[PDB]
């Protein structure tokens, strides 16, 4: 009890470079740990956990990354949240997530930005100093063909060569590729009033053009994220209020939102175009702004429990 297991692990982790979570059973309950931050998207969470279990059981090729995934579906429904959460659970921190925006690698000479200029990179140096990391490639269809070839090398041998010719090890990484292809086209067809078979057939040809079977066969799983239900959005709202409540808890102030108040923020904080991205500024504008005035005015004080309900002209604040 005096010297804990984390005490020993942190010594070993410092000398070896292996993260504490890897050194320290918990893979059996990996899905419930990811669900603490990621609401819904059960299929994506199952797929990720299953792949990680195959790797650790010694069932997969050792000369490859831990796992590789393609995440399809719309914007703002949990793709990045899962990647960040995966990094925190597996590698102890969100700093262990490396993000590559492929919109910045569309113009031919972008390969030198990835692996470094010729004798005359961002990804290579990043992974060199963090072997244990989650790498997120966003908007993968935007990538230049030559840039796309470098990604296939990582999938094929779990390593990568840079400018000098020296290798960078990718065997301890998790690769997540994300794309939005098809989702805007569906919204276009629904607004234009196309029948279903029109929308369905047009999505498959667009996916066919960009994602060929030679590429997809290298991946562990292809997962399509779905839009969030009204129930699930209410859970996001409750998660997003966490930091505010912790700030208010220092002055012993409670925020009891009524059921209609959560629906108010949920209706404005979510839409099919941007997903739940607008929610942060909706909370800031509709809740945090008028609450700040109440506190500054002297209506809300130390120890007061506040009821948040909805009338016309936005949210109303009441005290017992
Ligand atoms: N499944 C989810 N679980 C928890 N929060 C979510 C979920 N989906 C969306 N959000 C919230 O909405 C925001 C959407 O951003 P993000 O997930 O980064 O979008 P994308 O996945 O398109 O990159 C997040 O910051 C998060 O707070």
Please tell me about this protein's structure.
This is Chaperone protein ClpB. The chain is an alpha/beta fold and about 325 residues long. Helices cover about 50% and strands about 15% of the residues. It has 15 helices and ten strands. Strands 2-3-6-1-7 form a five-stranded parallel β-sheet, sandwiched between helices. Helix 9 (about 185-190) packs antiparallel against helix 10 (about 195-210) and helix 14 (about 260-270) crosses helix 15 (about 280-295). It is globular, with a radius of gyration of 23 Å. Adenosine-5'-diphosphate (ADP) binds near residues 41, 76 and 77.
CATH domain topology of the largest domain: Rossmann fold
The CATH superfamily of the largest domain appears as P-loop containing nucleotide triphosphate hydrolases
Number of DSSP helices? 15
What's the gyration radius in Å? 23 Å
What's the CATH class of the largest domain, please?
A: Alpha Beta
Strand order of the largest sheet: 2-3-6-1-7
Structural class: alpha/beta
Can you tell me the overall shape?
Answer: globular
Number of domains: 2
Helical content (DSSP H or I, runs of 4+): 40-55%
CATH architecture of the largest domain: 3-Layer(aba) Sandwich
State the end-to-end CA separation. 46 Å
* Number of E strands: 10
Q: How much β-strand is present in the residues?
A: 5-15%
The largest β sheet comes out as: 5 strands, parallel
Element string (H = helix, E = strand): HHHHEHEHHEHEEEHHHEHHEHHEE
Unique bound compounds: adenosine-5'-diphosphate
Subunit structure: Homohexamer. The oligomerization is ATP-dependent.
Subcellular location: Cytoplasm
Region (C-terminal): 228-320
Protein name: Chaperone protein ClpB
């Amino acid at each position: 009890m005096e010297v804990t297991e984390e005490d020993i692990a942190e010594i070993v982790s410092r000398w070896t470079g292996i993260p504490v979570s890897k050194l320290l059973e918990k893979l059996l309950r990996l899905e419930e740990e990811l669900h603490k931050r990621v609401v819904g998207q059960d299929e994506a969470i199952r797929a990720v956990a299953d792949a990680i279990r195959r790797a650790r059981a010694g069932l997969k090729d050792p000369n490859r990354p831990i796992g590789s995934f393609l995440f399809l579906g719309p914007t703002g429904v949990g793709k990045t949240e899962l990647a960040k959460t995966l990094a925190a659970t597996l590698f102890d921190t969100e700093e262990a997530m490396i993000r590559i925006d492929m919109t910045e690698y569309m113009e031919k000479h972008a390969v030198s930005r990835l692996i470094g200029a010729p004798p005359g990179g961002q990804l290579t140096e990043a992974v060199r100093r963090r072997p244990y990391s989650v790498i997120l490639f966003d908007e993968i269809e935007k990538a230049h063909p030559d840039v796309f070839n470098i990604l296939l090398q990582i999938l094929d041998d779990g390593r990568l060569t840079d400018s000098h010719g020296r290798t960078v090890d990718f065997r301890n990484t998790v690769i997540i590729l994300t794309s939005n292809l098809g989702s805007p086209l569906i919204l276009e067809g629904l607004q234009k009033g196309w029948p279903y078979e029109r929308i369905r057939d047009e999505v498959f040809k667009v996916l066919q053009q960009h994602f060929r079977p030679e590429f997809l066969n290298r991946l562990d799983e292809i997962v399509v994220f779905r839009p969030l239900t009204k129930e699930q959005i209410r859970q996001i709202v409750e998660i997003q209020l966490s930091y505010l409540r912790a700030r208010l808890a220092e002055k012993r102030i409670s925020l009891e939102l009524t059921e209609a108040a959560k629906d108010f923020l949920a209706e404005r904080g979510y839409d099919p175009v941007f997903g739940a991205r607008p929610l942060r500024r909706v909370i800031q504008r509709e809740l945090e702004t008028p609450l700040a005035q109440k506190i500054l005015a002297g209506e809300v004080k130390e120890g007061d429990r506040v009821q948040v309900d909805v009338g016309p002209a936005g949210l109303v604040f009441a005290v017992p």
